[PDB]
Coordinates of C-alpha atoms in Angstrom, one line a residue:
Chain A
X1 CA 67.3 85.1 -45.6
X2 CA 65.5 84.9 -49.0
X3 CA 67.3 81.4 -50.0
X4 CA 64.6 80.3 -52.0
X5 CA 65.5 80.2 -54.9
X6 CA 69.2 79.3 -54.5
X7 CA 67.2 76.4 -52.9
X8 CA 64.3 75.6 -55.2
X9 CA 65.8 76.1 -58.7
X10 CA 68.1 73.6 -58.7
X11 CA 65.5 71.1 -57.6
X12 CA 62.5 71.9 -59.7
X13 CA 65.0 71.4 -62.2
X14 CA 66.3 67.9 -61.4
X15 CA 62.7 66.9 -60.6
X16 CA 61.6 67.9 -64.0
X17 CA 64.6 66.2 -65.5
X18 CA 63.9 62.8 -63.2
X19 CA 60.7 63.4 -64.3
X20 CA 61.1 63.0 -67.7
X21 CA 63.5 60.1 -67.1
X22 CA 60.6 58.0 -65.5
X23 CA 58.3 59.4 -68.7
X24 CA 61.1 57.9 -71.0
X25 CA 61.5 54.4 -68.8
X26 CA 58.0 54.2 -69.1
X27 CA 58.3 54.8 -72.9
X28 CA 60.7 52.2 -73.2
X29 CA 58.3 49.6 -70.9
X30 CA 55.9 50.0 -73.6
X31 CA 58.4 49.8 -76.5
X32 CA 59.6 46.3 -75.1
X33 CA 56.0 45.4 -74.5
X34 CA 55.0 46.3 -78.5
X35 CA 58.4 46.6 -80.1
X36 CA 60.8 43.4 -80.4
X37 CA 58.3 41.9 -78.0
X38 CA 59.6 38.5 -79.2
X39 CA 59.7 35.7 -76.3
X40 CA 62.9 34.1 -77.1
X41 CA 65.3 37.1 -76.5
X42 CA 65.3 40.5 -75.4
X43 CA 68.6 42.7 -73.8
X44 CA 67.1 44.3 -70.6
X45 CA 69.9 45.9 -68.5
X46 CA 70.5 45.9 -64.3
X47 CA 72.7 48.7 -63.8
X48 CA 75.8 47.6 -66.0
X49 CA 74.8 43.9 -67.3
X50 CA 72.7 42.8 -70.0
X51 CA 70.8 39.9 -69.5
X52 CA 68.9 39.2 -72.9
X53 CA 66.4 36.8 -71.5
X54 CA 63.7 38.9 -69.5
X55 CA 60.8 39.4 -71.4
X56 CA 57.8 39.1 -68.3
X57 CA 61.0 39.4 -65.7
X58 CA 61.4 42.8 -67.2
X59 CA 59.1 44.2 -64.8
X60 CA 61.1 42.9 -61.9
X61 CA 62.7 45.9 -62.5
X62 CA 60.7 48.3 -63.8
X63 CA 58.2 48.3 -61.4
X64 CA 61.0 49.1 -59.0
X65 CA 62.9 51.8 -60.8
X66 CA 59.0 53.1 -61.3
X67 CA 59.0 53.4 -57.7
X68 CA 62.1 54.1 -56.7
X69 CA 61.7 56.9 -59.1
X70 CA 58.4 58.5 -58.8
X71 CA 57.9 57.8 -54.6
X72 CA 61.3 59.3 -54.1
X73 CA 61.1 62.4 -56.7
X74 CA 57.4 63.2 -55.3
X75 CA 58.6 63.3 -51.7
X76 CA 61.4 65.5 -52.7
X77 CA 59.1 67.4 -54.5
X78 CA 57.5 68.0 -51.4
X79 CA 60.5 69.1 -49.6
X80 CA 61.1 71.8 -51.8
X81 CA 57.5 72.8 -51.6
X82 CA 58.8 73.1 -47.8
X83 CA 61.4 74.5 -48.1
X84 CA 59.3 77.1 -50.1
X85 CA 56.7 77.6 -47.5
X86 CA 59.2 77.9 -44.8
X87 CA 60.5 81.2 -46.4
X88 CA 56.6 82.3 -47.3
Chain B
X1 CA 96.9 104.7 -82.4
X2 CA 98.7 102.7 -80.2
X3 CA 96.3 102.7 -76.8
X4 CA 93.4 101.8 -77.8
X5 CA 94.9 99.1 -80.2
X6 CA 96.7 98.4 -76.6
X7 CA 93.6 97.9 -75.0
X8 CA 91.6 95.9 -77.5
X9 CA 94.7 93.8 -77.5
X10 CA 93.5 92.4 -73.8
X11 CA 90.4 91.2 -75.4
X12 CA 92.4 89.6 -78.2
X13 CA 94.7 88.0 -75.7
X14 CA 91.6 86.6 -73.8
X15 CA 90.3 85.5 -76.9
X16 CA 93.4 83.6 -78.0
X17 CA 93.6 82.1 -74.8
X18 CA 90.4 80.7 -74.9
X19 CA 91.5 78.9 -78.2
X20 CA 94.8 77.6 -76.4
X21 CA 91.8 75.8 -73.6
X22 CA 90.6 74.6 -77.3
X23 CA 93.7 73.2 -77.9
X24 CA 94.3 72.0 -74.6
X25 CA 90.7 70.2 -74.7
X26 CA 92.0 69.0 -78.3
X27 CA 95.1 67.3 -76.4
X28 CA 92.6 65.6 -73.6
X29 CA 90.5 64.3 -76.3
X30 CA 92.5 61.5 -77.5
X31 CA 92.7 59.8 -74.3
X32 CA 89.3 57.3 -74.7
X33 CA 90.3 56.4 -78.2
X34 CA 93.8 56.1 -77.3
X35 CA 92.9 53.7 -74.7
X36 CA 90.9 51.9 -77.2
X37 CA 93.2 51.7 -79.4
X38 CA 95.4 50.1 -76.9
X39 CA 92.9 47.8 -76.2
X40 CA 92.4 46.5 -79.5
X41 CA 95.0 43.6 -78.7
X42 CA 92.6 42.3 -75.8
X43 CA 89.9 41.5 -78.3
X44 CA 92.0 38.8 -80.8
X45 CA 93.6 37.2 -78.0
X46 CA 90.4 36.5 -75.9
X47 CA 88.0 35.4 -78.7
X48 CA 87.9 31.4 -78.2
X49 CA 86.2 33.8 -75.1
X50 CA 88.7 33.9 -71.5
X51 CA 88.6 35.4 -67.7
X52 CA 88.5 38.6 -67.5
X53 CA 88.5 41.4 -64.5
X54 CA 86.6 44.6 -65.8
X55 CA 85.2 47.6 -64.1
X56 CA 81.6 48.0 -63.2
X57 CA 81.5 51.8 -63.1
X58 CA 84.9 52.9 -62.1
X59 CA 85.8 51.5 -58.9
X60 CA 84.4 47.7 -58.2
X61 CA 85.9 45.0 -60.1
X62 CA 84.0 41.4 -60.4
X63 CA 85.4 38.3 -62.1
X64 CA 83.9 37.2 -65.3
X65 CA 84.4 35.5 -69.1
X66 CA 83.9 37.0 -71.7
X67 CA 81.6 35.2 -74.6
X68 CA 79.7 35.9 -77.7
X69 CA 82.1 38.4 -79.9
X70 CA 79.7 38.1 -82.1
X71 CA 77.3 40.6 -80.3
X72 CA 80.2 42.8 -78.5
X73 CA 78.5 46.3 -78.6
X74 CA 79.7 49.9 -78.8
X75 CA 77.2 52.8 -77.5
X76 CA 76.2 55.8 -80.3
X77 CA 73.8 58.4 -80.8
X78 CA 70.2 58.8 -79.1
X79 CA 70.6 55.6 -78.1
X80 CA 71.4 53.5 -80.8
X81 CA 73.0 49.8 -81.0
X82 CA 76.4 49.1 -82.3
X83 CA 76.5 45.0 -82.4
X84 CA 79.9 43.8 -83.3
X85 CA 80.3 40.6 -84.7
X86 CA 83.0 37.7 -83.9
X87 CA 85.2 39.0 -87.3
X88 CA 84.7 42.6 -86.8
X89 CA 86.4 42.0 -83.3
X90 CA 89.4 40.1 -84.5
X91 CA 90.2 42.5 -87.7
X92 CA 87.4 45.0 -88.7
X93 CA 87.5 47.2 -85.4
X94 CA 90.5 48.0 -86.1
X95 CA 88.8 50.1 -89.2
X96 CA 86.3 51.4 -86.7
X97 CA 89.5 52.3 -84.5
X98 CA 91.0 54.2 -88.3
X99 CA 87.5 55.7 -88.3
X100 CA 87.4 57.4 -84.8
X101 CA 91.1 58.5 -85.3
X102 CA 90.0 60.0 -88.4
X103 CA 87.8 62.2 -86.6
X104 CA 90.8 62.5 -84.3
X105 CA 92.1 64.1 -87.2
X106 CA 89.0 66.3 -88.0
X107 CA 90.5 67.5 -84.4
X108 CA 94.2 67.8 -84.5
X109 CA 95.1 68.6 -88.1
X110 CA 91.5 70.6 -89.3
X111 CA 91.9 72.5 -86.1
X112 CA 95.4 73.1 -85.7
X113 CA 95.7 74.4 -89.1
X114 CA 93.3 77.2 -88.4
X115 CA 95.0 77.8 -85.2
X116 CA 98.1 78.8 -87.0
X117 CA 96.6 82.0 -87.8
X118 CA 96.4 82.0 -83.5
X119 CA 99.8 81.9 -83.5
X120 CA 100.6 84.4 -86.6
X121 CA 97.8 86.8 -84.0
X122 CA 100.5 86.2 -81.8
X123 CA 103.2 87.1 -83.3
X124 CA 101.2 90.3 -85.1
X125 CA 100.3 91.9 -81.8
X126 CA 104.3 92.8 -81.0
X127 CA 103.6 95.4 -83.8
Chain C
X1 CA 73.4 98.9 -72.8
X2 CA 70.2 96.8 -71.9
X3 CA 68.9 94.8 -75.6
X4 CA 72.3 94.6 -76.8
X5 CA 73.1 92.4 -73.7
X6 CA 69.8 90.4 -74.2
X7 CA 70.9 89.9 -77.5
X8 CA 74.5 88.8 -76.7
X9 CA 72.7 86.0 -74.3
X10 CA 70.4 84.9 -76.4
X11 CA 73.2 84.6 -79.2
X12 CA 75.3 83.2 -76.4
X13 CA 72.7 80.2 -75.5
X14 CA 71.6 79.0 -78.7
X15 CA 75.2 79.1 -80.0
X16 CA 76.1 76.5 -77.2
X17 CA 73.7 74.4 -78.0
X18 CA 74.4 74.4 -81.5
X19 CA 77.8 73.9 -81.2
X20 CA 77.3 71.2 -78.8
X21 CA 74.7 69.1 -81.4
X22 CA 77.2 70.1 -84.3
X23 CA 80.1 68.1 -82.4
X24 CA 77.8 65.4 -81.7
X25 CA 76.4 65.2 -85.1
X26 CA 80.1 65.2 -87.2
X27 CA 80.4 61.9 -85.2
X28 CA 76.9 60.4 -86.1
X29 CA 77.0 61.3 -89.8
X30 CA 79.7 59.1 -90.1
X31 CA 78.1 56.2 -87.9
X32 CA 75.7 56.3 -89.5
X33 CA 76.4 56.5 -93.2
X34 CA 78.7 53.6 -92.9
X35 CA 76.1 52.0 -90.8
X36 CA 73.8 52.4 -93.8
X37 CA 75.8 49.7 -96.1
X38 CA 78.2 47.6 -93.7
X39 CA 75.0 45.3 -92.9
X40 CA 76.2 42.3 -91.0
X41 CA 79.0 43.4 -89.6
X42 CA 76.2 45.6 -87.5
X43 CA 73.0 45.7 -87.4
X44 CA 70.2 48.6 -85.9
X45 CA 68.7 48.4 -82.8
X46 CA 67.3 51.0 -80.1
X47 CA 69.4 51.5 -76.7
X48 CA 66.4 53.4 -75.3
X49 CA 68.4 53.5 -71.9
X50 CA 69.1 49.8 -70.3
X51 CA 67.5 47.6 -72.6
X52 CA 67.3 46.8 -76.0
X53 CA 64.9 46.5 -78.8
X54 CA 65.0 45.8 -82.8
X55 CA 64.9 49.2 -84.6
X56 CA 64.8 49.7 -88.4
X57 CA 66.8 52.2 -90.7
X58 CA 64.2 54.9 -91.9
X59 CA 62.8 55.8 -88.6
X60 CA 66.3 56.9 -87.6
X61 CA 67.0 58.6 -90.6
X62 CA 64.1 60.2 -89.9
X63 CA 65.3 61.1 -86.8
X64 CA 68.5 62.4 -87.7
X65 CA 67.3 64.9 -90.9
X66 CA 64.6 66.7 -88.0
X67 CA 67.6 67.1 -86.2
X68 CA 69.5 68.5 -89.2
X69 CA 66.3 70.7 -90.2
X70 CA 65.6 71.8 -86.5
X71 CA 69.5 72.6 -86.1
X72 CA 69.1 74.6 -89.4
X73 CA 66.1 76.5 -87.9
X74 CA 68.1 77.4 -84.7
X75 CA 71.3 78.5 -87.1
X76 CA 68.8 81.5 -88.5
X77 CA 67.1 82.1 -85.5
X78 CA 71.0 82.9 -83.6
X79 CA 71.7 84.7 -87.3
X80 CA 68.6 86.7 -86.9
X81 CA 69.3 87.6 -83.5
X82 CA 72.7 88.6 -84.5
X83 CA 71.1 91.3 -87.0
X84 CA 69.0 92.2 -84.2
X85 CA 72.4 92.2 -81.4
X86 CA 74.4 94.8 -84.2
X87 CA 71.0 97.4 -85.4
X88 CA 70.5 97.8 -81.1
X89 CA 74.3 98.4 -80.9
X90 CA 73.8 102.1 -82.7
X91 CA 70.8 103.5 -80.7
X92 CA 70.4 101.2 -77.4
X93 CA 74.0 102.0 -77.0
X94 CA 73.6 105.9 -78.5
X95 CA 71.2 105.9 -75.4
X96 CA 73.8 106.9 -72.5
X97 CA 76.5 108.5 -75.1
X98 CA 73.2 110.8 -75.7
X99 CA 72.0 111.8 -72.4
X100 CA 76.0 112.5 -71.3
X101 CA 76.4 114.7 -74.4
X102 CA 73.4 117.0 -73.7
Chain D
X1 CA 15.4 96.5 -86.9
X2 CA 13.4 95.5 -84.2
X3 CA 14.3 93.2 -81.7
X4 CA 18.4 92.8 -80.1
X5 CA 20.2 91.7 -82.8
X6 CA 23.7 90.5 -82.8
X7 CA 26.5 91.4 -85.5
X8 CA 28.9 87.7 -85.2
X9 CA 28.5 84.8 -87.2
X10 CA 26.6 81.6 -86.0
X11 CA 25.1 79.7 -88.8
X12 CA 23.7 76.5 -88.2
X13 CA 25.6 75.4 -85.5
X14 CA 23.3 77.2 -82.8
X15 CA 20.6 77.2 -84.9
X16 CA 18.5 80.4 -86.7
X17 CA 15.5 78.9 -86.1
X18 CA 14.3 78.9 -82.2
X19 CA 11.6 80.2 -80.2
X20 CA 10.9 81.7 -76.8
X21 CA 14.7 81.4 -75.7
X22 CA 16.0 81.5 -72.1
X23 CA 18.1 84.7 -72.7
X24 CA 21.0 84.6 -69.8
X25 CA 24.1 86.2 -69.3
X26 CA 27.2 84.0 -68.3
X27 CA 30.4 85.4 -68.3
X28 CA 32.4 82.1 -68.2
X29 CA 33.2 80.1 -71.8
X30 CA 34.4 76.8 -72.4
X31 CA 38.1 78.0 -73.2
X32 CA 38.2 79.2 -69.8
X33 CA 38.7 75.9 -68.5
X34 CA 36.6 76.7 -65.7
X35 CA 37.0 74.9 -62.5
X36 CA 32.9 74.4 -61.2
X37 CA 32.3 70.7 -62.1
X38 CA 30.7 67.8 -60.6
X39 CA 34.3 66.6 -60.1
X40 CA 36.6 67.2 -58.0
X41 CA 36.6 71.3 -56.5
X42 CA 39.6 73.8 -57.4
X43 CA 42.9 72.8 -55.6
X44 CA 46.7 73.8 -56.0
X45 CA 48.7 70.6 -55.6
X46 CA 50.8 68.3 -58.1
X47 CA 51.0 65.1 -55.6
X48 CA 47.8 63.7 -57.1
X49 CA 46.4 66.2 -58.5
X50 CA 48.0 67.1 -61.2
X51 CA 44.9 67.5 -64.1
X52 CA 41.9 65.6 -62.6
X53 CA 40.0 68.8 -64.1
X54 CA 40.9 67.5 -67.3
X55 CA 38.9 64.7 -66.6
X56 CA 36.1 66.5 -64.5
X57 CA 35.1 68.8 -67.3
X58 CA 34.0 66.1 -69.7
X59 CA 30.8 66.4 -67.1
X60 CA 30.2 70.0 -68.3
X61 CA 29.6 69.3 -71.8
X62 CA 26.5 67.0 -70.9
X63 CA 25.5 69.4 -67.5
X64 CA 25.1 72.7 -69.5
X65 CA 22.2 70.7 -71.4
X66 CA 20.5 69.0 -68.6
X67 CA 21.2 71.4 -65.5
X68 CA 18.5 73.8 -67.4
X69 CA 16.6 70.9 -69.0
X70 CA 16.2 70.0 -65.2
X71 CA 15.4 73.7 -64.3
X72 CA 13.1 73.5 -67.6
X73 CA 14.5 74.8 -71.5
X74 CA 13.3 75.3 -74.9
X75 CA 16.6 77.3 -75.4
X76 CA 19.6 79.0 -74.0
X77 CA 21.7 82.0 -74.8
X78 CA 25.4 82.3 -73.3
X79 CA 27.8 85.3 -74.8
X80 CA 31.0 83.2 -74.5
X81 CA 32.8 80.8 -76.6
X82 CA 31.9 76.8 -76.6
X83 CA 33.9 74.1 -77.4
X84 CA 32.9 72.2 -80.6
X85 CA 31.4 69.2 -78.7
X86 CA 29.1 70.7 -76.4
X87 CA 28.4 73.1 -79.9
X88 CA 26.9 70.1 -82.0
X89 CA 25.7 69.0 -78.8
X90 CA 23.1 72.4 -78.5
X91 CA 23.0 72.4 -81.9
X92 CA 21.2 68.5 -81.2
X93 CA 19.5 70.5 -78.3
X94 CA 18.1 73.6 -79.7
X95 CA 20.1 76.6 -77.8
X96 CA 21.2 79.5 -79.6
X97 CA 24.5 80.5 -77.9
X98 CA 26.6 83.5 -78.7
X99 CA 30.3 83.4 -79.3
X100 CA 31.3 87.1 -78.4
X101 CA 28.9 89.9 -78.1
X102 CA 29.3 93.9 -76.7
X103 CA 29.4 93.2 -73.0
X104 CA 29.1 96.8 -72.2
X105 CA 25.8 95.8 -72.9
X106 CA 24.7 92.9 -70.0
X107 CA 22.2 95.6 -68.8
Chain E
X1 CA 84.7 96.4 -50.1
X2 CA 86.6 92.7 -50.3
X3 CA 83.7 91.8 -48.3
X4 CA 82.0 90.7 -52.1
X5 CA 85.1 89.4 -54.1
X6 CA 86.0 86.8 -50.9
X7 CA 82.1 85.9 -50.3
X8 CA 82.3 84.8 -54.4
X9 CA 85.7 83.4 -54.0
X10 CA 84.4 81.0 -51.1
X11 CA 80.6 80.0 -53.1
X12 CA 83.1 79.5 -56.3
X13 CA 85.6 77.0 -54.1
X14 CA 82.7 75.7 -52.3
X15 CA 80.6 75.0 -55.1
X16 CA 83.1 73.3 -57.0
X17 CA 83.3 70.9 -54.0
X18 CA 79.7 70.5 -53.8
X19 CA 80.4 69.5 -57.5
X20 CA 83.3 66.9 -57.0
X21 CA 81.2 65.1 -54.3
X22 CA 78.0 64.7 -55.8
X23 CA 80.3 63.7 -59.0
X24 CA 81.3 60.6 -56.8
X25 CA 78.1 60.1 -55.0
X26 CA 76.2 58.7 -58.1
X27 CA 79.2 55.8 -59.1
X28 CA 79.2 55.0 -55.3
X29 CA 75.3 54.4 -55.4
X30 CA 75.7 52.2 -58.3
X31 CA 78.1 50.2 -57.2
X32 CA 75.5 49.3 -54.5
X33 CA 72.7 48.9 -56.0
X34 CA 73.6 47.1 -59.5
X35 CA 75.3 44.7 -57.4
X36 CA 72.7 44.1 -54.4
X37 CA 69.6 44.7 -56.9
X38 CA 71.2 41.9 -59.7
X39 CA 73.7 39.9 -58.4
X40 CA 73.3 39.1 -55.1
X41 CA 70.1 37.3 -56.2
X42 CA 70.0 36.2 -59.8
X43 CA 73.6 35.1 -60.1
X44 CA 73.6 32.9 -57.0
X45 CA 71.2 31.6 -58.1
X46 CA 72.4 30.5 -61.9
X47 CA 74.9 31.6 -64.5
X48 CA 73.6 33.5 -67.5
X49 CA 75.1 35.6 -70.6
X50 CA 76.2 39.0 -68.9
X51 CA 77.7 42.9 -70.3
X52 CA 80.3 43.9 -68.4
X53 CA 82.6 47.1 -69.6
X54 CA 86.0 45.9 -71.7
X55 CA 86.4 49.9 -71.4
X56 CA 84.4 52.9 -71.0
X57 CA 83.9 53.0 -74.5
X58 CA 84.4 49.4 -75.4
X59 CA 81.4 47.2 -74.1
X60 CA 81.7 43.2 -74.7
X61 CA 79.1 40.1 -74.0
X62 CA 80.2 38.2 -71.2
X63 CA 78.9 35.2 -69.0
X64 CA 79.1 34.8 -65.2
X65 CA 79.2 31.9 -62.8
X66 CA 78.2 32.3 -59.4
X67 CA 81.4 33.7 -59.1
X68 CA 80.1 35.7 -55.8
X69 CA 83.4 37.3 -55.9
X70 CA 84.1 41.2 -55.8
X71 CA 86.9 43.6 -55.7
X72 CA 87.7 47.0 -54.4
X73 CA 90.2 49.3 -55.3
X74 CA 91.0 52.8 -53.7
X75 CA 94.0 53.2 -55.6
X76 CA 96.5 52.0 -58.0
X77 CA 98.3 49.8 -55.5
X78 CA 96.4 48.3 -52.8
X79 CA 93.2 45.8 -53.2
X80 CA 90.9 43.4 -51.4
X81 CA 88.5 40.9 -52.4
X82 CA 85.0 40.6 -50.4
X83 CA 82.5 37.7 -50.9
X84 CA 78.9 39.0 -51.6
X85 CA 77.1 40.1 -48.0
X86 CA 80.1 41.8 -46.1
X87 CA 81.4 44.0 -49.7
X88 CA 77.9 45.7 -49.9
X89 CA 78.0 46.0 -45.9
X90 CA 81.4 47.8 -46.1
X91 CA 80.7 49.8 -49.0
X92 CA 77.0 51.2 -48.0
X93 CA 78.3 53.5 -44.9
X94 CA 81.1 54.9 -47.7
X95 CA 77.9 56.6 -49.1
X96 CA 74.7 56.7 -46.8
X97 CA 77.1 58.0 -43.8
X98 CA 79.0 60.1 -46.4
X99 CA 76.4 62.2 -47.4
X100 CA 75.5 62.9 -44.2
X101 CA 78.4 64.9 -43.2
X102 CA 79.8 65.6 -46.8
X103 CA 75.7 67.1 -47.3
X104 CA 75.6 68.9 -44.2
X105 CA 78.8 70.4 -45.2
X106 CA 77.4 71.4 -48.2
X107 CA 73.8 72.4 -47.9
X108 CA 74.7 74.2 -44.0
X109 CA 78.2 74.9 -45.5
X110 CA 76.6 77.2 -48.2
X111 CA 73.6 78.5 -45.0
X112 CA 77.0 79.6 -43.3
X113 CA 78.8 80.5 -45.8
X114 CA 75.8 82.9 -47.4
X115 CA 76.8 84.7 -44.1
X116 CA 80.4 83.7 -43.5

């Protein structure tokens, strides 16, 4: 059966998206680190709270929505290369 | 004359129907201001700052007080901040809240209004 | 009738997308252009996502007139494809109504 | 006239003014992006590999100079385009390259 | 013959389940993680200056104690409380074993279904 595609679209398309969802959390890593980079208070968001007090503790984060993000979207990435090659 | 005016008539009918799901999206539009609206009232009596139990996403509920009206924030755009300060959320919301309804208005009346011809289509296509 | 249909989705597909920035952008102009003089009472920063940074007035109304000027492009492009949609609709369509007739 | 002459436009760039050239025939420019560098060897694979040619190919623009300096130059002649670096960088060297050229005409 | 209109009827009322479910999957997933990622740690350890939503289009300041107190509603009449180890432990099989079967009855659903 030539699923492929039915199979493939839909993720090269969230991966692309994910992708540049990672690009744009790294954009804002930057922005933090140049752009109101001041000490004394800064509203960095966990999932639905702001805590304006991170300014080095920000990367407790984004180091691990960095991860969670690319290691998981490069795996799947893989899969639906799989899922490609076991067709052809 | 009459049958192909009949049967261009389907395609008016389809297209008036897709401007009734306009007008029924119209209707379901209100609901988040609506909501805020009612929930105006929370924000004078809670600003010497109070308990409050508040959704996280939809479902999970944690206890918490609420503080610093001052800063109370409303998402817009790209992206963009919206900080409220402690007199904007006593009285001046409620002007943001006439704002929002005025683009409620921009919905209901500057839509409705050219949805009458809709309905004068309507009535037309007995002849 | 093949161009005329090309057309049609290509008319169809920038039309959403211009409708869809249109309903977003009667909203911002407002925002915005009592955001411009209620100082104070608010005041601009970036919610690039979940966090927070100090942003400054001119860089967003720069953003928001390349959004009206792109949205302006995309308005003649859809236009010009509509031109294009109605001079296929006499000979792409002609094309069966032709080869029936003789 | 006498001689192969060439009907483009090449200035000073690859200079007029050379002798006893090393006349060649390579069939590969520098807008072709071309894969054969010291680097890293043509692969199909986004993982990790996503542009490391981008980075390999900066050793080209030195290598087409000192690959035949090596073999032993007092010019060169190649019929495809060059990026601008590696342009100034035989103009500095003394090779008269050619951006296009009848091709018909290798033989 | 109806072989075509009931194979498009079936991906239609399949696909918008597939919709519905990942449309609760993602609100599921954050209620996990914002909670075991943040709170769990940072506020028992301390209380700090918090967001929390006054609506879904209202969004006020708040500050939290360690509070370490959590609630969970299925509906509009019936709720339970959970401290801050055995809420997360009830609430990650509603989602990692969900997708398992909801998934399989999606993804092997539609391989069935692309010949049912």
């Amino acid at each position: 059966f030539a699923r492929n595609t039915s199979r493939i679209t839909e993720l090269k398309e969230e991966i692309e998206v994910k992708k540049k969802q990672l690009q744009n959390l790294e954009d804002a890593c930057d922005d933090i680190m140049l752009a109101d980079d001041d000490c004394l208070m800064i509203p960095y968001q966990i999932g639905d709270v702001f805590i304006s007090h991170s300014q080095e503790e920000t990367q407790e984060m984004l180091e691990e929505a960095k991860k969670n993000l690319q290691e998981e979207i490069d795996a799947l990435e893989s899969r639906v290369e799989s899922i490609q090659r076991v067709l052809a | 004359n009459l049958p192909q005016l009949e049967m261009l008539k389907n395609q008016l009918d389809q297209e008036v129907e897709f401007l009734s799901t306009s007008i029924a999206q119209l209707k379901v539009v209100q609901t988040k201001y609506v909501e805020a609206k009612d929930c105006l009232n929370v924000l004078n009596k809670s600003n010497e700052g109070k308990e409050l139990l508040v959704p996280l996403t939809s479902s999970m509920y944690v206890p918490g007080k609420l503080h610093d009206v001052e800063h109370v924030l409303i998402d817009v755009g790209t992206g963009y901040y919206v900080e409220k300060t402690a007199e904007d959320a006593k009285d001046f919301f409620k002007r943001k809240i006439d704002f929002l309804t005025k683009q409620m208005e921009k919905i209901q009346p500057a839509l409705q209004e050219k949805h009458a011809m809709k309905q004068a289509v309507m009535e037309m296509m007995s002849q | 009738v093949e161009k005329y249909q090309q057309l049609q989705k290509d008319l169809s597909k920038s039309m959403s997308g211009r409708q869809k920035l249109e309903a977003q952008l009667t909203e911002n102009n407002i925002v915005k252009e009592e955001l411009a003089l209620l100082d104070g009472s608010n005041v601009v920063f970036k919610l690039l996502g979940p966090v927070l940074v100090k942003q400054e007035l001119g860089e967003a109304r720069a953003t928001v007139g390349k959004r009206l000027d792109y949205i302006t492009a995309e308005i003649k492009r859809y236009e010009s494809q509509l031109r294009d949609l109605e001079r296929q609709s006499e000979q792409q369509r002609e094309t069966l109504a032709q080869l029936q007739q003789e | 006239d006498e001689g192969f002459l060439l009907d483009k436009k090449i200035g000073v760039n690859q200079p007029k003014r050379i002798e006893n050239a090393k006349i060649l025939i390579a069939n590969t420019g520098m807008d072709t992006d071309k894969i054969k560098i010291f680097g890293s060897r043509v692969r199909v694979d986004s993982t990790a590999k996503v542009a490391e040619i981008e980075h390999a190919e900066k050793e080209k623009m030195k290598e087409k100079v000192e690959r035949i300096l090596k073999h032993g130059i007092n010019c060169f002649i190649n019929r495809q385009l060059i990026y601008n670096y590696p342009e100034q960088l035989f103009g500095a060297a003394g090779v008269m390259a050619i951006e296009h050229a009848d091709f018909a005409g290798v033989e | 013959d109806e072989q075509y209109q009931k194979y498009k009827f079936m991906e239609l009322n399949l696909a918008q389940k597939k919709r519905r479910l990942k449309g609760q999957i993602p609100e599921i997933k954050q209620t996990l993680e914002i909670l075991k990622y943040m709170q769990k740690k940072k506020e028992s350890t301390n209380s700090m200056e918090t967001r929390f939503l006054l609506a879904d289009n209202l969004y006020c300041k708040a500050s939290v104690p360690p509070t370490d107190k959590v609630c969970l509603w299925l509906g509009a009449n019936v709720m339970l409380e959970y401290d801050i180890d055995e809420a997360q432990a009830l609430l990650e099989k509603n989602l990692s074993t969900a997708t398992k079967n909801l998934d399989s009855l999606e993804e092997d659903l539609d391989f069935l279904r692309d010949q049912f």
